[PDB]
């Protein structure tokens, strides 16, 4: 459990938590502060349940796409590093973790998918997605396959869909518009249709996930896979001679992977914020800190400039960064949740044949665009009435109601955050104010008197 005088960190199990634990032991050796790293299941979903409780972590690690919601709900502490420290990380990595003009996390590394081919089976990897059907059958003649990758998570199948024109939300004037969802445009329809055709000619199987796809490549059963740097570790241990190169082109235009920024967010309810800032700045985000984690599971291209020149020499990094520039940086807005869920539903149905491509994408468009609107009213729907609300609207689509749950859980962390604040323990002042300002006249007076009290 969390309490004053120690750090608890959450990171996804596919990353190098053991190496991260090493960095904390140094910290513990230098400060006497016990550092404990955990890797829970679905920490992306478990966090918004337990953040503002005594069961949430001090530091949370995830790609930058989740943090906008976290931030909007006032569940993160404003990161306040000196200019000299900011000038040690790449500026565009700071953009990712910047939401509404405020820094909400420490950017760690850059994550971008890449084509991971087996050199023993593929000296000249294909340049285009349209070459692959011919190569696979040639490998079918060897009882082999050309490609296998996780098909259950939309993270991995997006690069092909967004190649010719598909996108999440339109970007313009330096801003995203959540009403313009580019999941059902011409460029998106072609990518998925091309993907399914690969499966329908049984160049792939729909049940392929990370665990199995990983096994396939690691045992030299498929010539290619698509995965991130964190996966090179297990592959390095396996006896496969592999290469990491650029993703294949499609219709002249490259497959555009959503680029990820691994980021470290400080719980606003953590009683050891400065204690955390000390760790991330002066231990992890150092040439040795990052080296310790990378040795466990490769991070990719780090945001720390001093240690990026070190990794840039690795061709597998050069491959990723190329794909990174070719692809797009994930938005960090609170609506990316609505976008992901809708797509996760669409691909599984268009892959299992349960629906047309035109249908799933049409439905995903609607559900995402609609569910994306729920966030603008998250703070308005008065307290005790969020379930009555969403039940009043009665949308009932599985991916839509998933956002409802999330939002319903955000509102529950803010009430909890308010509870902590009332009892004089750490709390995020935004989560507090959002809760009072929907708690009738009594909330608003309580809200403002604090705003006035706070003016000291
Ligand atoms: O659809 C279910 C799932 O959608 C969301 O997951 C997305 C992540 O938010 C997003 O960061 C990305 O996930 C990848 C990570 O960025 C990266 O760290 C790496 O480890 O691979 C991840 C893919 O497994 O893309 C996924 C969509 O697949 C949402 O976060 C989840 O709550 C939700 O369960």
């Amino acid at each position: 459990k969390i309490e004053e005088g120690k750090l608890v960190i959450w990171i996804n199990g596919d990353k190098g938590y053991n190496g991260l634990a090493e960095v904390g032991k140094k910290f513990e050796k230098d400060t006497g502060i016990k550092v404990t790293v955990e890797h829970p299941d679905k920490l992306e979903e478990k966090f918004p349940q337990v953040a503002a409780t005594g069961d949430g972590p001090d530091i949370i690690f995830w790609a930058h796409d989740r943090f906008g919601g976290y931030a909007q709900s006032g569940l993160l502490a404003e990161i306040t590093p000196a200019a000299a420290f900011q000038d040690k990380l790449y500026p565009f990595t700071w953009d990712a973790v910047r939401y509404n003009g405020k820094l909400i996390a420490y950017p760690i590394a850059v994550e971008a998918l890449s084509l991971i081919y087996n050199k023993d089976l593929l000296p000249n990897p294909p340049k285009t997605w349209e070459e692959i059907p011919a190569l696979d059958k040639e490998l079918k003649a060897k009882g082999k396959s050309a490609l296998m990758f996780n098909l259950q998570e939309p993270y991995f199948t997006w690069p092909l869909i967004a190649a010719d024109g598909g996108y999440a939300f339109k970007y313009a004037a330096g801003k995203y518009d959540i009403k313009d969802v580019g999941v059902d445009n011409a460029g998106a329809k072609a990518g998925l249709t091309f993907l399914v055709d690969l499966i329908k000619n049984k160049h792939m199987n729909a049940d392929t996930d990370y665990s199995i796809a990983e096994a396939a490549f690691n045992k030299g059963e498929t010539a290619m896979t698509i995965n991130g740097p964190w996966a090179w570790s297990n592959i390095d241990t396996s006896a496969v001679n592999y290469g990491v190169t650029v993703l294949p082109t499609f219709k002249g235009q490259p497959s555009k992977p959503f680029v990820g920024v691994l980021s470290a967010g400080i719980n606003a309810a953590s009683p050891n914020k400065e204690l955390a800032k000390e760790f991330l700045e002066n231990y992890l985000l150092t040439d040795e800190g990052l080296e310790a984690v990378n040795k466990d599971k490769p991070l990719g291209a780090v945001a720390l400039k001093s240690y990026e020149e070190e990794l840039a020499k690795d061709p597998r990094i050069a491959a990723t960064m190329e794909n990174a520039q070719k692809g797009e940086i994930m938005p960090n807005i609170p609506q990316m949740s609505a976008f992901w869920y809708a797509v996760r539903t669409a691909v599984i149905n268009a892959a299992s044949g349960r629906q047309t491509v035109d249908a799933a994408l049409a439905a995903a468009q609607t559900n995402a665009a609609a569910a994306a609107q729920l966030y603008d009213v998250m703070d308005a729907v008065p307290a005790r009435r969020w379930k009555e609300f969403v039940r009043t609207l009665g949308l009932r689509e599985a991916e839509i109601e998933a956002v409802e749950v999330e939002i319903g859980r955000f509102r529950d962390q803010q009430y909890e955050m308010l509870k902590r604040w009332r009892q004089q323990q750490p709390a995020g002042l935004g989560a507090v104010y959002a809760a009072l300002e929907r708690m009738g006249l009594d909330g608003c007076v309580e809200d403002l008197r604090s705003r006035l009290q706070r003016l000291e």
Side-chain angles (χ1 to χ4, degrees), residues 196 200 206 346-357:
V196 306
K200 322 329 298 182
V347 178
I348 61 170
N349 304 340
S352 67
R354 194 180 197 94
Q355 277 187 51
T356 322
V357 173

mmCIF file of all heavy atoms in Angstrom, residues 196 200 206 346-357:
data_model
loop_
_atom_site.group_PDB
_atom_site.id
_atom_site.type_symbol
_atom_site.label_atom_id
_atom_site.label_comp_id
_atom_site.label_asym_id
_atom_site.label_seq_id
_atom_site.Cartn_x
_atom_site.Cartn_y
_atom_site.Cartn_z
ATOM 1 N N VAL A 196 -7.522 -7.951 -44.037
ATOM 2 C CA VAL A 196 -8.386 -9.128 -44.001
ATOM 3 C C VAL A 196 -8.004 -10.086 -45.122
ATOM 4 O O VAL A 196 -7.810 -11.287 -44.898
ATOM 5 C CB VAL A 196 -9.870 -8.718 -44.068
ATOM 6 C CG1 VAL A 196 -10.195 -7.700 -42.975
ATOM 7 C CG2 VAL A 196 -10.249 -8.162 -45.434
ATOM 8 N N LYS A 200 -7.798 -13.910 -45.138
ATOM 9 C CA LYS A 200 -8.800 -14.728 -45.808
ATOM 10 C C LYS A 200 -8.142 -15.713 -46.761
ATOM 11 O O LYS A 200 -8.631 -16.837 -46.926
ATOM 12 C CB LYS A 200 -9.808 -13.855 -46.559
ATOM 13 C CG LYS A 200 -10.229 -12.543 -45.878
ATOM 14 C CD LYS A 200 -10.245 -12.545 -44.333
ATOM 15 C CE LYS A 200 -11.227 -13.535 -43.739
ATOM 16 N NZ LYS A 200 -11.192 -13.431 -42.253
ATOM 17 N N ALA A 206 -6.730 -15.440 -37.457
ATOM 18 C CA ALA A 206 -7.334 -14.340 -36.711
ATOM 19 C C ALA A 206 -7.052 -14.426 -35.216
ATOM 20 O O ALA A 206 -7.046 -13.398 -34.531
ATOM 21 C CB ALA A 206 -8.842 -14.310 -36.957
ATOM 22 N N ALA A 346 -13.830 -3.193 -33.877
ATOM 23 C CA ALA A 346 -14.030 -3.281 -35.319
ATOM 24 C C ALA A 346 -13.149 -4.355 -35.939
ATOM 25 O O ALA A 346 -13.615 -5.144 -36.768
ATOM 26 C CB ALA A 346 -13.753 -1.926 -35.968
ATOM 27 N N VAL A 347 -11.874 -4.404 -35.550
ATOM 28 C CA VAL A 347 -10.938 -5.306 -36.212
ATOM 29 C C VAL A 347 -11.256 -6.756 -35.874
ATOM 30 O O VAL A 347 -11.156 -7.640 -36.731
ATOM 31 C CB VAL A 347 -9.492 -4.941 -35.838
ATOM 32 C CG1 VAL A 347 -8.517 -5.908 -36.486
ATOM 33 C CG2 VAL A 347 -9.178 -3.515 -36.265
ATOM 34 N N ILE A 348 -11.638 -7.032 -34.624
ATOM 35 C CA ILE A 348 -11.934 -8.409 -34.241
ATOM 36 C C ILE A 348 -13.127 -8.939 -35.021
ATOM 37 O O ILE A 348 -13.190 -10.134 -35.337
ATOM 38 C CB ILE A 348 -12.168 -8.515 -32.722
ATOM 39 C CG1 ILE A 348 -13.369 -7.663 -32.298
ATOM 40 C CG2 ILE A 348 -10.904 -8.104 -31.963
ATOM 41 C CD1 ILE A 348 -13.817 -7.901 -30.866
ATOM 42 N N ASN A 349 -14.087 -8.073 -35.347
ATOM 43 C CA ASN A 349 -15.246 -8.512 -36.116
ATOM 44 C C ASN A 349 -14.924 -8.605 -37.600
ATOM 45 O O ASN A 349 -15.296 -9.583 -38.259
ATOM 46 C CB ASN A 349 -16.415 -7.561 -35.881
ATOM 47 C CG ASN A 349 -16.759 -7.427 -34.419
ATOM 48 O OD1 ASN A 349 -16.401 -8.282 -33.609
ATOM 49 N ND2 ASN A 349 -17.455 -6.352 -34.067
ATOM 50 N N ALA A 350 -14.235 -7.600 -38.143
ATOM 51 C CA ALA A 350 -13.808 -7.660 -39.534
ATOM 52 C C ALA A 350 -12.773 -8.751 -39.769
ATOM 53 O O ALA A 350 -12.605 -9.194 -40.910
ATOM 54 C CB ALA A 350 -13.242 -6.309 -39.968
ATOM 55 N N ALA A 351 -12.073 -9.185 -38.723
ATOM 56 C CA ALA A 351 -11.131 -10.290 -38.840
ATOM 57 C C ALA A 351 -11.812 -11.641 -38.670
ATOM 58 O O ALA A 351 -11.486 -12.592 -39.389
ATOM 59 C CB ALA A 351 -10.016 -10.142 -37.806
ATOM 60 N N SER A 352 -12.746 -11.747 -37.727
ATOM 61 C CA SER A 352 -13.517 -12.969 -37.542
ATOM 62 C C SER A 352 -14.638 -13.114 -38.561
ATOM 63 O O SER A 352 -15.375 -14.104 -38.509
ATOM 64 C CB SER A 352 -14.108 -13.014 -36.130
ATOM 65 O OG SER A 352 -15.089 -12.008 -35.957
ATOM 66 N N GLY A 353 -14.782 -12.161 -39.480
ATOM 67 C CA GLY A 353 -15.852 -12.199 -40.451
ATOM 68 C C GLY A 353 -17.217 -11.849 -39.907
ATOM 69 O O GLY A 353 -18.187 -11.855 -40.672
ATOM 70 N N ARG A 354 -17.327 -11.536 -38.614
ATOM 71 C CA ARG A 354 -18.627 -11.226 -38.035
ATOM 72 C C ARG A 354 -19.252 -9.989 -38.661
ATOM 73 O O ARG A 354 -20.460 -9.777 -38.513
ATOM 74 C CB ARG A 354 -18.499 -11.029 -36.525
ATOM 75 C CG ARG A 354 -19.829 -11.048 -35.786
ATOM 76 C CD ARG A 354 -19.636 -10.839 -34.295
ATOM 77 N NE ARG A 354 -20.810 -11.234 -33.516
ATOM 78 C CZ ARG A 354 -20.983 -12.426 -32.949
ATOM 79 N NH1 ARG A 354 -20.059 -13.373 -33.064
ATOM 80 N NH2 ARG A 354 -22.090 -12.676 -32.261
ATOM 81 N N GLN A 355 -18.467 -9.172 -39.359
ATOM 82 C CA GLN A 355 -18.996 -7.965 -39.970
ATOM 83 C C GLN A 355 -18.174 -7.603 -41.195
ATOM 84 O O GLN A 355 -17.008 -7.983 -41.326
ATOM 85 C CB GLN A 355 -19.002 -6.791 -38.987
ATOM 86 C CG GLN A 355 -20.202 -6.767 -38.067
ATOM 87 C CD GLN A 355 -20.265 -5.503 -37.240
ATOM 88 O OE1 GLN A 355 -20.176 -4.395 -37.772
ATOM 89 N NE2 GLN A 355 -20.414 -5.659 -35.929
ATOM 90 N N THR A 356 -18.812 -6.863 -42.093
ATOM 91 C CA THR A 356 -18.108 -6.260 -43.209
ATOM 92 C C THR A 356 -17.050 -5.291 -42.693
ATOM 93 O O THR A 356 -17.099 -4.820 -41.553
ATOM 94 C CB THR A 356 -19.090 -5.515 -44.114
ATOM 95 O OG1 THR A 356 -20.314 -6.251 -44.198
ATOM 96 C CG2 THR A 356 -18.511 -5.331 -45.511
ATOM 97 N N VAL A 357 -16.074 -4.999 -43.551
ATOM 98 C CA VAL A 357 -15.156 -3.901 -43.273
ATOM 99 C C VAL A 357 -15.909 -2.575 -43.285
ATOM 100 O O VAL A 357 -15.743 -1.739 -42.388
ATOM 101 C CB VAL A 357 -13.994 -3.907 -44.285
ATOM 102 C CG1 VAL A 357 -13.121 -2.657 -44.125
ATOM 103 C CG2 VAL A 357 -13.160 -5.175 -44.126
#
